[PDB]
Tab-separated table of C-alpha atoms and ligand atoms in Angstrom:
chain	number	residue	atom	x	y	z
S	5	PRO	CA	0.000	0.000	0.000
S	6	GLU	CA	2.684	2.531	0.957
S	7	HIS	CA	4.042	2.544	-2.604
S	8	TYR	CA	0.913	4.272	-3.984
S	9	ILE	CA	-1.128	5.763	-1.077
S	10	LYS	CA	-0.818	9.336	0.135
S	11	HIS	CA	0.043	9.731	3.810
S	12	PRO	CA	-2.941	11.117	5.762
S	13	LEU	CA	-2.595	13.857	8.348
S	14	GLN	CA	-4.215	13.705	11.775
S	15	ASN	CA	-6.319	16.756	10.892
S	16	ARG	CA	-7.621	18.532	7.817
S	17	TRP	CA	-6.189	22.035	7.457
S	18	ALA	CA	-7.258	25.195	5.636
S	19	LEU	CA	-4.810	27.820	4.361
S	20	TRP	CA	-6.106	31.401	4.275
S	21	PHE	CA	-4.798	34.562	2.628
S	22	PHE	CA	-5.479	38.164	3.651
S	23	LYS	CA	-4.600	41.354	1.764
S	24	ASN	CA	-5.215	44.791	3.250
S	25	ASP	CA	-7.615	46.777	1.071
S	26	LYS	CA	-9.096	49.903	2.621
S	27	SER	CA	-12.049	49.789	0.193
S	28	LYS	CA	-13.328	46.631	1.929
S	29	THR	CA	-14.123	45.457	5.439
S	30	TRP	CA	-11.666	43.231	7.280
S	31	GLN	CA	-13.764	40.077	6.872
S	32	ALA	CA	-14.160	40.757	3.145
S	33	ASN	CA	-10.365	40.697	2.705
S	34	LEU	CA	-10.086	37.121	4.030
S	35	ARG	CA	-9.803	34.532	1.253
S	36	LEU	CA	-9.487	30.759	1.567
S	37	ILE	CA	-6.775	29.311	-0.661
S	38	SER	CA	-7.169	25.543	-0.339
S	39	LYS	CA	-7.690	22.679	2.089
S	40	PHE	CA	-5.503	19.599	2.493
S	41	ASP	CA	-5.294	16.494	4.674
S	42	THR	CA	-2.236	14.592	3.360
S	43	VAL	CA	1.520	15.065	3.645
S	44	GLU	CA	1.928	15.176	-0.137
S	45	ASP	CA	-0.794	17.786	-0.679
S	46	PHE	CA	0.682	20.090	1.971
S	47	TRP	CA	4.101	20.150	0.304
S	48	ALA	CA	2.531	20.667	-3.124
S	49	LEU	CA	0.637	23.687	-1.794
S	50	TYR	CA	3.601	25.055	0.179
S	51	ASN	CA	5.939	24.840	-2.830
S	52	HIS	CA	3.465	26.705	-5.071
S	53	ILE	CA	2.744	29.744	-2.881
S	54	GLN	CA	4.977	32.693	-2.093
S	55	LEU	CA	7.236	32.719	0.912
S	56	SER	CA	6.235	35.216	3.565
S	57	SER	CA	9.644	36.786	2.923
S	58	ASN	CA	8.258	37.940	-0.451
S	59	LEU	CA	4.783	39.110	0.582
S	60	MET	CA	3.832	42.768	0.450
S	61	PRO	CA	3.309	44.416	3.856
S	62	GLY	CA	-0.268	44.216	5.095
S	63	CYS	CA	-0.857	40.575	4.072
S	64	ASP	CA	-1.333	37.462	6.216
S	65	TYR	CA	-1.082	33.695	5.944
S	66	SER	CA	-3.357	31.594	8.157
S	67	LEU	CA	-3.430	27.820	8.647
S	68	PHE	CA	-6.391	26.680	10.738
S	69	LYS	CA	-8.102	23.372	11.416
S	70	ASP	CA	-11.046	22.645	9.141
S	71	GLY	CA	-14.113	24.130	10.795
S	72	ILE	CA	-12.280	26.972	12.565
S	73	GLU	CA	-12.216	30.317	10.791
S	74	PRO	CA	-9.277	32.740	11.116
S	75	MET	CA	-11.453	35.006	13.271
S	76	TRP	CA	-11.250	35.725	16.967
S	77	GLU	CA	-15.070	35.693	16.810
S	78	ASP	CA	-15.026	31.963	16.007
S	79	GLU	CA	-16.623	29.657	18.559
S	80	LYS	CA	-13.293	27.884	19.115
S	81	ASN	CA	-11.377	31.198	19.304
S	82	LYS	CA	-13.334	33.662	21.475
S	83	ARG	CA	-12.219	32.120	24.791
S	84	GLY	CA	-8.660	31.472	23.589
S	85	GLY	CA	-5.419	33.265	22.886
S	86	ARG	CA	-2.118	33.173	21.048
S	87	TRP	CA	1.584	32.663	21.690
S	88	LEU	CA	3.165	35.687	20.012
S	89	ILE	CA	6.521	36.018	18.234
S	90	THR	CA	7.755	39.489	17.253
S	91	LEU	CA	10.136	39.937	14.314
S	92	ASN	CA	12.181	42.965	13.279
S	93	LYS	CA	13.386	43.664	9.739
S	94	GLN	CA	16.626	41.736	10.287
S	95	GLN	CA	14.635	38.719	11.501
S	96	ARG	CA	12.476	38.846	8.355
S	97	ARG	CA	15.611	37.973	6.376
S	98	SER	CA	17.091	35.524	8.899
S	99	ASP	CA	14.158	33.835	10.670
S	100	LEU	CA	10.785	34.651	9.062
S	101	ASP	CA	10.659	31.687	6.670
S	102	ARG	CA	12.229	29.193	9.095
S	103	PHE	CA	9.864	30.080	11.937
S	104	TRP	CA	6.712	29.958	9.801
S	105	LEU	CA	7.601	26.592	8.265
S	106	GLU	CA	8.451	25.196	11.700
S	107	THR	CA	5.116	26.592	12.903
S	108	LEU	CA	3.306	24.812	10.056
S	109	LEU	CA	5.155	21.596	10.909
S	110	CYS	CA	4.239	21.937	14.589
S	111	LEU	CA	0.562	22.042	13.596
S	112	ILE	CA	0.299	19.294	10.960
S	113	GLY	CA	2.762	17.069	12.823
S	114	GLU	CA	0.746	17.330	16.062
S	115	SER	CA	3.886	18.197	18.003
S	116	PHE	CA	2.142	19.256	21.234
S	117	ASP	CA	1.361	15.751	22.600
S	118	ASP	CA	-2.055	15.596	24.342
S	119	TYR	CA	-2.513	19.370	24.116
S	120	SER	CA	-2.493	19.408	20.299
S	121	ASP	CA	-6.298	19.393	20.545
S	122	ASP	CA	-6.111	22.921	21.979
S	123	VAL	CA	-4.363	24.228	18.854
S	124	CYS	CA	-6.689	26.080	16.484
S	125	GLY	CA	-4.233	27.410	13.923
S	126	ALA	CA	-1.335	29.731	13.193
S	127	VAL	CA	-1.036	33.232	11.726
S	128	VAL	CA	1.920	35.132	10.271
S	129	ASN	CA	1.491	38.893	9.802
S	130	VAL	CA	3.719	40.702	7.296
S	131	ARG	CA	3.810	44.360	8.355
S	132	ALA	CA	6.125	47.275	7.636
S	133	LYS	CA	6.401	47.996	11.376
S	134	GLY	CA	7.433	44.394	12.106
S	135	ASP	CA	6.321	40.827	11.411
S	136	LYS	CA	4.463	38.564	13.834
S	137	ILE	CA	3.903	34.809	14.084
S	138	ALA	CA	1.302	33.347	16.433
S	139	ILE	CA	-0.127	29.954	17.370
S	140	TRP	CA	-3.795	30.196	18.365
S	141	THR	CA	-5.228	28.020	21.152
S	142	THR	CA	-8.871	27.442	22.031
S	143	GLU	CA	-8.930	28.173	25.792
S	144	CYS	CA	-6.845	30.857	27.504
S	145	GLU	CA	-7.671	29.569	31.006
S	146	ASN	CA	-6.049	26.134	30.492
S	147	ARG	CA	-2.666	26.856	32.056
S	148	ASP	CA	-1.394	23.311	31.518
S	149	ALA	CA	-2.317	23.294	27.826
S	150	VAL	CA	-1.224	26.850	27.036
S	151	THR	CA	2.139	26.781	28.806
S	152	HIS	CA	3.127	23.350	27.491
S	153	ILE	CA	2.488	24.534	23.932
S	154	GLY	CA	4.603	27.599	24.685
S	155	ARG	CA	7.495	25.480	25.940
S	156	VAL	CA	7.316	23.100	22.978
S	157	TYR	CA	6.971	26.004	20.524
S	158	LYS	CA	9.895	28.030	21.877
S	159	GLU	CA	12.203	25.005	21.847
S	160	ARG	CA	11.109	24.042	18.323
S	161	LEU	CA	11.958	27.525	17.050
S	162	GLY	CA	15.328	27.311	18.789
S	163	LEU	CA	14.856	30.474	20.813
S	164	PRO	CA	17.474	30.955	23.559
S	165	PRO	CA	16.564	31.447	27.239
S	166	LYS	CA	17.462	35.138	26.908
S	167	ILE	CA	14.262	35.662	24.875
S	168	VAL	CA	10.799	35.462	26.439
S	169	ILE	CA	7.527	35.072	24.528
S	170	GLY	CA	4.083	36.012	25.804
S	171	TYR	CA	0.603	34.508	25.536
S	172	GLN	CA	-2.316	36.926	25.160
S	173	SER	CA	-6.035	36.263	25.470
S	174	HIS	CA	-7.999	37.294	22.382
S	175	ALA	CA	-10.500	39.137	24.595
S	176	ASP	CA	-7.685	41.349	25.894
S	177	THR	CA	-6.336	41.917	22.370
S	178	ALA	CA	-9.667	43.294	21.101
S	186	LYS	CA	-1.327	42.003	28.572
S	187	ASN	CA	0.370	38.596	28.740
S	188	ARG	CA	-1.542	35.828	30.500
S	189	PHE	CA	1.546	33.588	30.519
S	190	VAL	CA	5.214	33.850	29.559
S	191	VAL	CA	7.709	31.128	28.719
Q	201	P3E	C1	-8.549	40.166	18.205
Q	201	P3E	C2	-7.665	39.695	17.242
Q	201	P3E	C3	-6.517	39.013	17.622
Q	201	P3E	C4	-5.644	38.549	16.646
Q	201	P3E	C5	-5.916	38.768	15.299
Q	201	P3E	C6	-7.063	39.452	14.910
Q	201	P3E	C7	-7.310	39.652	13.539
Q	201	P3E	N1	-8.365	40.687	13.267
Q	201	P3E	C8	-8.097	41.914	12.801
Q	201	P3E	N2	-9.256	42.548	12.643
Q	201	P3E	C9	-9.743	43.898	12.245
Q	201	P3E	O1	-8.712	44.607	11.488
Q	201	P3E	C10	-8.365	45.810	12.200
Q	201	P3E	C11	-6.893	46.242	12.116
Q	201	P3E	O2	-6.037	45.131	12.360
Q	201	P3E	P1	-4.912	45.220	13.496
Q	201	P3E	O3	-5.487	46.108	14.581
Q	201	P3E	O4	-4.489	43.861	14.015
Q	201	P3E	O5	-3.662	46.071	12.835
Q	201	P3E	P2	-2.594	45.328	11.863
Q	201	P3E	O6	-1.264	45.351	12.399
Q	201	P3E	O7	-3.108	44.004	11.678
Q	201	P3E	O8	-2.711	45.995	10.575
Q	201	P3E	P3	-1.938	47.433	10.316
Q	201	P3E	O9	-1.270	47.790	11.628
Q	201	P3E	O10	-0.962	47.376	9.158
Q	201	P3E	O11	-3.107	48.542	10.099
Q	201	P3E	C12	-3.000	49.503	9.021
Q	201	P3E	C13	-4.289	50.262	8.659
Q	201	P3E	O12	-5.232	49.352	8.052
Q	201	P3E	C14	-6.471	49.438	8.733
Q	201	P3E	N3	-7.004	48.121	8.387
Q	201	P3E	C15	-6.532	46.927	8.730
Q	201	P3E	N4	-7.274	46.010	8.115
Q	201	P3E	C16	-8.173	46.638	7.358
Q	201	P3E	C17	-9.132	46.175	6.558
Q	201	P3E	O13	-9.300	44.967	6.421
Q	201	P3E	N5	-9.955	47.064	5.864
Q	201	P3E	C18	-9.738	48.427	6.037
Q	201	P3E	N6	-10.500	49.310	5.398
Q	201	P3E	N7	-8.757	48.836	6.854
Q	201	P3E	C19	-7.974	47.949	7.492
Q	201	P3E	C20	-5.967	49.533	10.147
Q	201	P3E	O14	-7.024	49.961	11.008
Q	201	P3E	C21	-4.987	50.662	9.958
Q	201	P3E	O15	-5.693	51.888	9.758
Q	201	P3E	C22	-8.618	45.364	13.650
Q	201	P3E	O16	-8.707	46.505	14.511
Q	201	P3E	C23	-9.965	44.776	13.467
Q	201	P3E	O17	-10.895	45.816	13.141
Q	201	P3E	C24	-10.226	41.742	13.066
Q	201	P3E	N8	-11.554	41.943	13.092
Q	201	P3E	C25	-12.390	40.989	13.507
Q	201	P3E	N9	-13.701	41.210	13.544
Q	201	P3E	N10	-11.870	39.761	13.899
Q	201	P3E	C26	-10.488	39.576	13.842
Q	201	P3E	O18	-10.044	38.483	14.193
Q	201	P3E	C27	-9.693	40.570	13.413
Q	201	P3E	C28	-7.930	39.912	15.896
């Protein structure tokens, strides 16, 4: 079988694109690119789309589980939050692509052990004032789930102990609940 069957992923994922157009509302600028649920289809999609290094400022990439929209209003997002990573212009050249791909691999590979059910998706923001990468979780009050994801994430990215990342509730964003 392995010689001809695609390798299924634990979850089905949806990749979203966002471009900032002042003529439209924020929700109207969200566009769904494609959905995938196999290892082969992910790499086909990833190799066909632009790297975030080469996106114009004001655009976003979002990878979310099928059934969860890239909105904080979503049922699985309103009571949750995100682990935030801030990038300067030097990091856009050095780390932007590596961190986003590692983020994608942490989602589709289910790298967070039992707490991978609390992951909702990931977002990279390409802005002129600085780039951001976030992993969204479903419940901000689950200290065990949120902090374990933060520890696994920070080690996966290779961040040194001198750097600290913060987790912010989406309700507050519209302060850091935890830091790791
Ligand atoms: C809570 C949360 C947590 C994490 C992520 C999100 C994502 N999110 C973001 N928004 C809305 O989008 C506004 C600006 O977004 P941000 O405040 O995050 O600012 P950014 O850094 O993203 O962008 P920018 O600094 O380069 O801004 C540059 C200039 O463009 C204006 N602008 C930005 N976009 C649009 C747009 O789409 N059309 C128009 N005409 N102008 C826009 C900005 O105002 C500024 O004048 C924000 O207030 C909200 O209304 C959301 N809305 C709902 N309902 N749900 C969400 O989940 C959500 C939300």
